[PDB]
Every structure is written in C-alpha cells, then in structure tokens.
Amino acid sequence: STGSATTTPIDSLDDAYITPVQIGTPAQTLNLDFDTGSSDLWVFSSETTASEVDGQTIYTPSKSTTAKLLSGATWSISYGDGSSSSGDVYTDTVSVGGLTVTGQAVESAKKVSSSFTEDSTIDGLLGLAFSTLNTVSPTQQKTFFDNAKASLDSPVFTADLGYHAPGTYNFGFIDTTAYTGSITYTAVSTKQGFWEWTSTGYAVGSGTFKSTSIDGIADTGTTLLYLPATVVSAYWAQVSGAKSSSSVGGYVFPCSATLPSFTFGVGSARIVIPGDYIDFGPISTGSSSCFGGIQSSAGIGINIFGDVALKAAFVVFNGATTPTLGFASK
Numbered sequence: 001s002t003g004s005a006t007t008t009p010i011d012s013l014d015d016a017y018i019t020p021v022q023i024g025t026p027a028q029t030l031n032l033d034f035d036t037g038s039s040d041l042w043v044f045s046s047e048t049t050a051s052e053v054d055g056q057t058i059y060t061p062s063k064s065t066t067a068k069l070l071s072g073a074t075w076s077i078s079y080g081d082g083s084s085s086s087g088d089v090y091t092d093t094v095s096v097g098g099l100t101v102t103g104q105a106v107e108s109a110k111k112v113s114s115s116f117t118e119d120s121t122i123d124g125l126l127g128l129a130f131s132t133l134n135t136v137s138p139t140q141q142k143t144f145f146d147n148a149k150a151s152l153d154s155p156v157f158t159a160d161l162g163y164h165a166p167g168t169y170n171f172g173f174i175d176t177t178a179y180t181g182s183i184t185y186t187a188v189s190t191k192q193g194f195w196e197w198t199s200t201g202y203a204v205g206s207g208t209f210k211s212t213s214i215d216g217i218a219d220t221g222t223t224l225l226y227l228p229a230t231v232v233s234a235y236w237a238q239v240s241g242a243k244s245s246s247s248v249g250g251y252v253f254p255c256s257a258t259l260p261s262f263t264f265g266v267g268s269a270r271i272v273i274p275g276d277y278i279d280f281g282p283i284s285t286g287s288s289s290c291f292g293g294i295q296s297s298a299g300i301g302i303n304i305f306g307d308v309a310l311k312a313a314f315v316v317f318n319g320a321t322t323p324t325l326g327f328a329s330k
C-alpha cells in the first residue's frame with residue numbers, strides 16, 4: 001500500500017509545515033507537524049489543560065469507537081528549542097493520505113509548553129525518527145512509519161517541502177516525476193536515533209567548494225539550517241553588514257541585502273539552496289534588520305539540516321534494514 005498527503009507552510013516564512021492526519025473512528029482530522037527529528041505522535045486533546053489550548057483542533061478519544069486507553073502508560077518529551085509536552089497514551093486508528101495503521105499509539109497531551117499554545121495552527125506532531133527515541137513509559141511505542149513499514153510497497157517515505165508553497169509527503173513509493181536528475185543516496189547512522197548522515201562539504205555563492213565532513217541530521221521538524229561556526233561565519237562574511245547579534249540570538253543582516261546561495265554536498269552531488277530561502281524577514285515588525293536562515297550549531301551540539309536545506313531537495317527516507325538518505329535536485 002501507499003499514502004500521499006499535501007503539506008502546507010503555516011505562515012509566510014515557512015516556519016513549519018502541517019499535514020492533515022485522520023485519527024479515530026469516525027475520523028477526527030488534525031493538522032500535524034511531521035518531524036523526522038523526534039519519534040512521538042502526540043496531539044492536543046480533550047485532556048489538555050484548557051488554559052493551554054488556544055485555537056488548536058483537539059482529539060477527543062471518548063468520541064472514537066476504536067480508541068483504547070493504554071493502561072498506565074505516560075509520555076514526556078523535551079525538544080532542543082526548549083519546548084515540551086506530556087500526557088497519557090491511547091491506541092487508535094491513524095490514516096495519512098489513504099495509508100491506514102491500526103493500533104497506533106496516540107499520545108494525548110495533558111500539558112504543553114507555551115510555544116505550542118501560541119502556535120494555533122499546529123495540532124500536534126507526528127514523529128518520523130527511529131522508534132528508539134519514543135518517550136512512552138514503561139513500554140516504548142513504535143512510530144507511524146515503523147508500524148506501516150511491513151504493508152508499504154517500499155519501506156520508504158519522501159519529503160518534498162515547498163518554498164512558500166504546498167508540498168508532499170509520500171509513503172511507500174518514490175515519485176520519479178517530482179525531481180530532476182538522479183537521486184544520490186548516502187549512509188545513515190541510527191546510533192543516536194536520528195536520520196544522521198555526513199555531508200561532504202559546502203560552497204558559498206559562486207565560491208570554491210570546500211571538501212569537509214559535516215555530520216548532521218535531516219530534521220523536517222526544525223526550521224533553520226544549523227552548521228558549524230566556521231561554515232556559518234564564512235557564509236555571512238559574504239553579506240555586507242551581516243553580524244552575529246547576542247540580543248537577537250544569531251546572525252542578522254540588512255533587509256536590503258541580496259543573499260548568496262548555499263551549496264551542500266551529498267556524496268559527489270551538490271544541492272543548492274537559493275539565497276532567498278535564507279531570508280527569514282525582519283527581527284521585529286517594521287525593523288530593517290532581518291533574521292538569517294543559516295545559524296551556528298555551536299550551542300546545540302549537533303548540526304541540523306532543517307527545512308531551509310530540505311526544501312531545496314527531494315529527500316528520500318529509506319527505512320530498509322540498512323537505512324539510507326536520498327537527495328535529488330528539483
């Protein structure tokens with residue numbers, strides 16, 4: 001079987017992408033943030049503290065004839081940005097673009113951090129990293145992808161995120177009309193539970209390509225591109241007036257500047273991020289200082305190929321027994 005669903009940016013800056021997901025019987029449709037950097041499927045629900053819900057669509061397990069409470073199970077997650085949520089666990093039927101999994105663990109939020117409350121357009125997250133990172137206790141639960149794997153035509157899913165435009169998540173098949181040229185596959189390490197791979201280098205604008213190994217993770221759940229300080233300094237040095245601002249929390253640049261492209265290596269192939277993808281607009285309304293889409297990973301501890309990088313490519317997440325990542329231009 002296969003599944004295909006349209007994913008849509010939540011705002012004008014592509015800060016995140018939401019994808020409709022059907023949960024329960026009869027279907028309750030929630031718009032979830034597909035996150036290859038985490039492994040929990042959690043949703044706003046009728047159990048969430050009322051003061052922490054502000055416009056989100058909630059999952060109501062008592063109205064689903066297929067929902068079953070997972071006795072004694074709890075979950076608690078903390079994301080790298082400081083966000084967090086926690087609650088109890090149900091099992092229920094979950095469908096993505098025609099692809100149905102029965103008995104999927106649906107984690108019901110009882111408490112969410114402020115960053116989720118203020119994001120009225122995200123009803124929850126659908127984790128697509130490896131199941132070893134799932135936070136359900138005392139019995140760890142499997143991801144949607146892991147549960148669907150055996151029934152998929154091919155054990156893959158693909159991410160085709162749009163620039164200021166809708167895109168597609170496909171499960172079980174590779175749309176050969178969605179990309180140009182060939183797909184270049186590269187090795188994945190699962191030792192940390194992430195889709196972790198090694199980029200072969202980078203170039204700034206039309207500059208020389210620098211061959212250097214950059215270990216990082218492919219994370220649809222992170223907005224920006226987080227790279228080592230040496231790389232990020234080399235990029236912003238080519239932008240007149242750009243500087244690192246401690247008060248803002250990263251590199252900013254004059255909004256009137258034109259940004260150079262950024263190239264990263266995948267084996268012998270090259271993925272080019274257009275300069276416009278790196279512009280994330282004024283730091284505050286009316287400001288002439290703009291926030292950069294490439295930032296340092298020094299404070300994070302890991303390099304993150306977030307949406308800024310992934311939306312420049314067609315990305316294959318190959319969940320075979322030896323997993324690999326595929327990148328193609330589009």
Ligand SMILES: NCc1ccc(C(F)(F)F)cc1
Nearest residue numbers: 037038079080219221222302
């Ligand atoms: N998108 C989920 C996520 C959040 C944080 C991290 C970090 F920062 F710990 F690497 C990775 C993945």
Ligand SMILES: NCc1ccc(C(F)(F)F)cc1
Nearest residue numbers: 079083115116119122221222
């Ligand atoms: N990396 C996972 C993640 C995704 C979205 C959010 C936000 F923006 F909704 F708070 C936080 C953390």
